[PDB]
């Protein structure tokens, strides 16, 4: 009775990250405790376990089947068909469990309990190749002929029994169906895989792919001619490669699949026999197109890996172009190009859409984070309270200035108040001398309650990085707090 | 008189689509029906089936020609000269009706009354090469070859004669014209193909052409050799291929041209004489040029799947760069991934484009949909009518907040109010021990009539979806509906 | 004196069309008759066909320089030699009249009177390489050496000498220069190829720019094995091709170098001395780079051509996941879809950009030419004036409707009036039967004068495409114009 | 105490580019200065002319260790010892150096003073491999042989001792990871090839890169049949290469592996033993797989290049598609034609976004250097003061009309005034014949300080270029300055 509950989802990084929190993962706890058979669901540890198991031993068959079936002649030993029997027993327990598990859609937890609803959707999806190569189809075909042909050995059919039973255990590999999908189903469910698409694991994917093609190929240019029983013009009898060991003949039929699929060559010579041009020309094609295919893939997905520089660099050829198109004396050309490298940093993002896409929550984290020891350093905004002060905090403005700009001018307008950031400014007067300010200090007080004439011309000694903050916002946020509205005039 | 209404579009599934309302098949029955004489509707059922009999005369003629001409030494026989004639005799009546047809261009009907405009279009586009492609000019040239020269089988002149006819009746295959035409028509015409681009239709569609390009290129590898007559330095002469069967001929010379195409190979060997390095280099460039430019082709066709995707980790890149350049804490971080994750889904898309694009209709059936038993909850409103309720509908906002938020701030001005559609929050007060909403609920009500603090705080204990609605929308929607203004107060 | 005058740009399509207008094409007549010393204009006729013979010489060059160095022992004959110094003559002249020219910069005139000027940019860019190219080096060479060596044809020298001028002839194919600036030049100027990027013009010139480097490639396998006098490992000397004809060996070193281009092979056999395996490696590394930066260049530039098309199967599938995330019934998803290919049939555009770029002039060309009959069929607009016609049209929307809305909803708030454009409408009232308007007409006409409740309810009976007409925007227009704000309340 | 100076950064082109002022400059050289002990600044003149001692070392060393290890026979000799003692002094002092340096992070000084921060971080990422490429790992491993085996030259060990010395020898060339390394560092710091992504510094760095390991391969491809001691079946032995000299086994080794990599061929044949063929078809399937991507990554970075000009395209055929939607008269399909290529000049830009981008300080530094000359020109404005001045010139509007527009009708309502700033319009009157204005003129004075309608009405007689200045933007600039306000009426 215990052991029923690894059937359910329980507390782990995993579960813990794709939930967000262990409420959540007791929430669905209790939604597959609806439940009254054992269901299992998809993210039980149990079915981890299971997968794991079972991923290992669809590899270890779609390796090993082929090179069972081709070489070996009289592949049936006292071992392989311990291997055979062991390797179904867990399939069929897999087509069998398959039936009575949880499905996952769009990440909305599927967990179906009626059997009906879940075997019918597999039914229509995969039943049916799990079934065709669950059971050991070859065995029953070799049963039924064992029990009706007594003179089976005697007669020539056990020569084509032979032969059918070798394409007959074919089936088996089709186990590749449910490769991809459990690896497809642990990968995307997989989160620390399913982030920055993980270029790494699907380009090791996509060469696992190729490989096994390629060594499937290979044990198919070497099934066709045996099963003719080594034609006088089959590779493996021009390369005098009848009478060598498994290793060298898998070695090099290997070779000839690889050759074909990157488009070398065939192999120490050209086709021959009618069945050695049909086959090399079926592995040209599929080889050489599937290889191809898989190289525009990893190209693209390489490609994709340096987007958001990509974007950088047409954005700046476009100031290029709107440069040009005004002929900009070389002077003002390159502060433009000092002031986009300093800003962009060749990277491109966008801190309005970013802040339009989060959560107000999130906003008011970042905001907060961004601002707090600038604006709690005034002491007219830090003796207010948090409403006041994080309701305007949300009309303060990102600006990068240059060494050299007169951030202010010296007896104007200063419709904006700034808070630095970063870098260092140096306040000028005509009368004082100098003075400076830097990293989280502020200046520009003289504007917000009275609007006159700056006292000063302040500039940026190196790349500053104020924080501007404006009076008709200012009055905005003020008219809707008339508490504040009233205290500001003294 | 009656068979000549299937020369008129019918109700069918797929006019039906295309057209969008039976009274609209009516409407263009009508259209056509402007007509005196029989005009074929391009999609008269009619049309339809005579275009699925031709494709299948032009892809057998296409196939079955070239393997006609080059082997079966002496290719007239018994048979044979009924196909050329059958096939003539349909492609004649496809020349004929071909003047007399429903031309469609943009979607809009162009069925043209006027056989002089349809005939003249087609004078222009394609009559030409459908011209020359139809009478059997090689029989007409051997018919004016025979009467004029009793002495043909004397003179040289004949043999001269049978490589002109068996050049000549190369013409028939530029009905390649025609096939292409009918598939494109067949295809975009059809709806659903023309649906997701249908990438399956599209990369068979590619896949046939290489296969044809290719068996053309085996067939004239081996046309050319046979014309001068087999010299001693043709491929057929030194792979001993002269005295083979037409299967062995024509299975290694596809061979050899599929070798050129993908740049594996020559063949047995690397040519010798001059028509062989000839024929060996045009096939090498235009079948390497055409294979490459197929497979830029099919891997742009299948990057083109995943754009959806792509489009989203782009914008993700862009977040994370935007959260280092401000250096966020890697709690901070890992929030917004969370959220992130949990909004696009590994997809994007815009509820506020995708709804300006669509009609007043269509928007208001989405609205409706997604909000009609969340606002018809609340009393205040479903007790209105559909006109104030579906003109306030337009100004909720959509919203999905994260396990742990305070949707709400104790004691804090509550300028919108929410309405949940998803998850489970919990509302909390000081007071008041627990409560619960979720899935259809409401909450927020005491700021709607007055403004004032809110008396709770509330917290997304999962992953709610609330459909926010603010109060400056509300009493702009509210001054344009006075019956209402009046009644709120109460 | 009166043939100074095609030195100056006339009165010709391709002048008239880069120019826009004959007082245009006269104005540069004039900018160039600035001129006091007869300066060819870069557009003047003259230069044109000075051109075309040009780039006729050039081509004819590099193809038969190469031909003539490395085949035809004892290459100088009595023809060949009128032919390089023929060909010496124009490109002296071209190199002369290259300082007397017009350069063009940006599409404005930058023809410049001061010879130095643009003797000083000429010097800078080409005239080195030019000038290199231009005079026989050769002859000149063998010259300062037939003098100085009386015993030339004694000494070793003379073969030393002979490998010298077969050498230093080679530099005459550096006017490969001339003919791609040239070719650039009048296919950018050239209008009618500047249009759709031309992508024919684009490809063909690649495939003319590797043809040549193959074609330059096959004449160097043949050259290189030559100068060392056919060793007894070079191909030539393997191949047995000491002896042949010059088109033997012409086309199969053509054949060699295609395949090292294409990487199909070597050709007859693999090489064997130093040479040629230097030589095979320099040509497989050059020419399958090339190749395949011309195939990454023609797949982009062809998938270019499709982007209309791509943009909007992106847009549809962010539609199909606005649709998903928000799960609606399978008979609005079908609407929508149904819609979206009626209205972008599967291509962007967007009404509101692309007339946010054009000028006011353009604006309202196309807003005449789109709203004239339509807002003319009005009583109430008609009689008024053009200013107020013309300025109220710009209020207009577009809209596709789809059959079976109600563009109206009966008894209802009718704050915009519709002018119908295409398709048809039925208008209907619960005690009037049926009315209908189509194709022009207009309706929605109560709503105007005074608001209040509609007297109807109409229906899209196929695709309509009316044409709305708000009344917020009506009155702003109207308050500018007081002049019809009177009459409108009688 | 002198010499430790160039240890900190100085004034020099680079660190005064990527510094910005040469106070920056002092101001680093006093953030280093905040050190007790010599601390390497990573852009102190010492450590670059280091590296590029450094750079020379580790390209000698990957070129030249395989080429020792593999041929020479023997390889120790009085040289090429001495040689690896030198390189292992100056990479020992890399090792020890490596640890006291100036780190940069973000382009931020990460100069750490802790060396236990630095070292930490230096041991995380490369020191292990560093260590381990560092020391020579062969002597070292020869030296506890030859101590302990008295009789290892008379043992079997020796020969196995002597294929260990050659194979351990092999570490060296990890090197290549401070070879990437370092060129990242001074390719990304560098400035000048860190602009324009330098394409041409790119594609040679993936040229360099392909060309190195080709060369590893040529030099693998030898030195594994070589370690068996050239069996009867390695290509070195079929080839008859035992004997040669090591410049033609190393041309011809070289060759094969650039076979591999093309995917041409293999060499003279085709492997016949097992080392050859798994050497064969590792070097096949990782040349094959590095050459496809590196050309996917050329191509992708040359058709980076035309990304303004592919944009203008597509942006192009979005207007050919709203054009024809509309079925404009290819009248007006010309005019816009020509509109566009004549304002866009086929690369796109965005005088909006691009002047949102800049700060304050180059908006009004592009926004003065265009329209200075031009508002001054005018008396009213020039007479006022910079304030309003510069204040009013950010509401001016660009605009390029077309030969023929009526930029003013006759008699009509003027609600903005133009600047001219190119081409040449023609004002006309009923009254007056004629009169020009051209090149920085202004027209349209009557309509500012009163509205009414327009006396004349002028007409773009050449592609003008005029300044828009509307009078609602005009007004509101106005009210911001009652000082000028009051003045205008007189």
Same mark, same amino acid.
Request: proline share 3%; aromatic share 14%; charged share 20%.
């Given at each position: 009775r215990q052991?029923?509950?690894?059937?359910?989802p329980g507390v782990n990084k995993f579960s813990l990250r794709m939930f967000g929190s262990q409420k959540a993962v007791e929430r669905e706890q209790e939604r597959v405790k609806s439940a009254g058979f054992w269901i299992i669901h998809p993210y039980s540890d149990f079915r981890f376990y299971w997968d794991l198991?079972?991923? !290992?031993?669809?590899?270890?068959?779609?390796?090993?089947?082929?090179?069972?079936?081709?070489?070996?002649?009289?592949? *049936?030993?006292?071992?392989?068909?311990?291997? *055979? =029997?062991?390797?179904?027993?867990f399939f069929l327990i897999d087509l069998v469990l398959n039936f009575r598990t949880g499905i996952v859609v769009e990440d909305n937890t599927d967990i179906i309990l009626?059997?009906?609803?879940?075997? &019918?959707? %597999? !039914?229509?999806?995969? $039943?049916?190749?799990?079934? @065709?190569?669950?059971? #050991?189809?070859?065995?029953?075909?070799?049963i039924v002929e064992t029990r009706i042909d007594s003179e089976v050995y005697k007669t020539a059919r056990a020569l084509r029994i032979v032969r059918f039973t070798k394409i007959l255990s074919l089936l088996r590999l089709l186990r590749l169906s449910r490769l991809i999908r459990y690896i497809h189903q642990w990968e995307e469910i997989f989160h620390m895989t399913y982030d920055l698409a993980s270029a =790494? =694991?699907?380009?090791?994917?996509?060469?696992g792919m190729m490989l096994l093609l390629c060594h499937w190929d290979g044990c198919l240019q070497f099934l066709v001619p045996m099963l003719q029983d080594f034609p006088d013009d089959c590779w493996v009898?021009?390369?005098?490669?009848? *009478? +060598?060991?498994?290793?060298?003949?898998?070695?090099?039929? !290997?070779?000839?699949?690889?050759?074909?699929?990157?488009?070398?060559?065939?192999?120490?010579?050209?086709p021959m026999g009618m069945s050695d041009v049909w086959l090399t020309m079926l592995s040209m094609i599929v080889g050489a197109t599937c290889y191809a295919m898989f190289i525009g893939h990893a190209t693209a997905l390489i490609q994709s890996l340096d987007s958001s520089r990509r974007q950088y660099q047409e954005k %700046?050829?476009? =100031?290029?172009?709107? &440069?040009? $198109?005004?002929?900009? #004396?070389?002077?003002?050309?390159?502060?433009?190009?000092?002031?986009?490298?300093?800003? %962009?940093?060749?990277? &491109?993002?966008?801190?309005?859409?970013?802040?339009?896409?989060?959560?107000? #929550?999130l906003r008011e984290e970042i905001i907060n984070f961004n601002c707090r020891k600038l604006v709690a350093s005034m002491p007219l905004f830090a003796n207010a309270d948090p409403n006041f002060v994080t309701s305007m905090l949300t009309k303060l403005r990102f600006e990068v200035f240059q060494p050299g700009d007169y951030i202010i001018r010296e007896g104007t307008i200063g419709?904006?108040?700034? $808070?630095?950031?970063?870098?260092?400014?140096? @306040?000028?007067?005509?009368? +004082?001398?100098?003075?400076?300010?830097?990293?989280?200090?502020?200046?520009?007080?003289?504007?917000?309650?009275?609007?006159?004439?700056?006292?000063?011309? @302040?500039?940026?000694?190196?790349?500053?990085? !104020? %924080?501007?903050?404006?009076?008709? *916002? $200012?009055?905005?946020?003020?008219?809707?707090? #008339? &508490?504040?509205?009233?205290?500001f005039e003294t």
């Open positions: 052991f029923g509950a690894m059937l359910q198991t079972m991923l !290992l031993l669809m590899v270890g068959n779609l390796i090993i089947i082929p090179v069972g079936i081709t070489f070996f002649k009289d592949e *049936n030993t006292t071992p392989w068909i311990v291997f *055979n =029997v062991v390797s179904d027993t009626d059997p009906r609803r879940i075997k &019918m959707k %597999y !039914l229509k999806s995969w $039943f049916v190749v799990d079934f @065709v190569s669950s059971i #050991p189809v070859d065995y029953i075909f070799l =790494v =694991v699907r380009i090791v994917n996509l060469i009898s021009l390369n005098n490669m009848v *009478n +060598n060991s498994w290793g060298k003949q898998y070695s090099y039929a !290997l070779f000839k699949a690889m050759s074909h699929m990157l488009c070398i060559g065939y192999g120490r010579q050209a %700046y050829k476009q =100031v290029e172009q709107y &440069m040009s $198109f005004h002929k900009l #004396p070389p002077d003002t050309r390159q502060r433009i190009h000092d002031y986009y490298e300093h800003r %962009y940093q060749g990277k &491109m993002f966008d801190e309005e859409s970013i802040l339009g896409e989060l959560s107000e #929550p419709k904006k108040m700034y $808070f630095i950031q970063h870098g260092v400014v140096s @306040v000028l007067t005509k009368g +004082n001398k100098e003075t400076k300010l830097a990293d989280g200090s502020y200046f520009g007080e003289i504007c917000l309650l009275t609007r006159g004439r700056r006292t000063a011309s @302040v500039r940026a000694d190196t790349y500053c990085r !104020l %924080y501007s903050l404006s009076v008709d *916002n $200012f009055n905005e946020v003020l008219e809707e707090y #008339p &508490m504040m509205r009233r205290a």
